[PDB]
Write a protein that binds this DNA or RNA. Structure first.
Ligand code: ZN
Length: 264
DNA sequence: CTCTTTTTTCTC
DNA sequence: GAGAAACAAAGAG
């Protein structure tokens, strides 16, 4: 559930529920709704989906211009539109009923969260969570990026995973990015040379953008997993130097890299 | 079998 | 700057 995959879901839902009126909201795992499902039911029932935007890995349902629904898929949250009488599968937790169908949210690990936030609190929400700039040449200022990177001793992969220097990078794309920029995941940010930072900054925007267009690496119906150079390729040869991709643990996360291309 | 492995928040 | 917790199932051997 990284920015590429979340953006793919935003567009799918975008062209399938925007403008639809909500008839009622049923929940079998209500606590998932951190702000009180009851309060959410009383307020979104009988509304219209105005739009579905995204910020980092968070989906934002715009229902009426009073409240915004912040949705986060965590590790395996997943939406799907199905028949009104469709049967209830094992890990379905919420359903948004429409006049002609329903939006179902599933999540095996129950990690996912839902939040109803008044329109004016959207920005303070992300600013309170310290979410960095979207991965675009316009919002991802390289200088600020360089500045933050030389001021820290944090290891690169962990630090990128924080969403602070930039938003959207998860385990898959950080490994892809770091390899594409020839930076070892344990390299301390304050040692990075500008040319490295510059290459990193660009590889970030580049790979996340490439992923968006390939529909994300949905192991839905995405094709980015077909172009992964190191994530999960443990034991396979490096696209460039041919060395065997190694897998190690960094800050508790499976980390794939190349011993040679990624020096550090 | 049995153990390992698969986003964000919080406690230090 | 680490570790744990939430939680459930595929994967490895
Ligand atoms: Zn290599």
């Amino acid at each position: 559930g990284e920015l590429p995959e979340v953006e793919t879901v935003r567009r799918e839902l975008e062209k399938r529920i925007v403008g639809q009126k909500i008839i009622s909201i049923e929940a079998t795992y209500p606590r998932m709704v951190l702000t009180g499902f009851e309060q959410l039911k009383k307020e979104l029932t009988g509304k219209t989906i105005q739009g579905i935007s995204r910020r980092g890995k968070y989906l934002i349902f715009e229902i009426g211009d009073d409240f915004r629904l912040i949705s986060h898929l965590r590790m395996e949250g997943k939406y799907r539109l199905a028949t009104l009488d469709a049967p209830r599968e094992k890990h379905d937790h919420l359903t948004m009923k429409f006049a002609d169908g329903q939006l179902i949210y599933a999540d095996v690990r129950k990690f996912g969260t839902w939040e109803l936030i008044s329109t004016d609190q959207v920005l303070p929400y992300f600013l309170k969570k310290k979410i960095g700039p979207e991965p675009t040449y316009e919002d991802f200022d390289e200088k600020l990026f360089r500045e933050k990177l030389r001021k820290s001793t944090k290891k690169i992969k962990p630090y990128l995973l924080e969403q602070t220097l930039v938003a959207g990078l998860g385990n898959i794309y950080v490994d892809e990015v770091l390899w594409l920029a020839k930076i070892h995941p344990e390299k301390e940010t304050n040692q990075l040379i500008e040319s490295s930072i510059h290459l990193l900054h660009d590889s970030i925007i580049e790979i996340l953008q490439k992923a968006i267009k390939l529909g994300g690496s949905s192991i839905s119906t995405g094709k980015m997993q077909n172009e992964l150079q190191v994530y999960g390729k443990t034991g396979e040869k490096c696209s460039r130097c041919g060395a065997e991709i190694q897998k190690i643990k960094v800050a508790g996360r499976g980390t794939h890299f190349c011993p040679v291309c990624q020096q550090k």
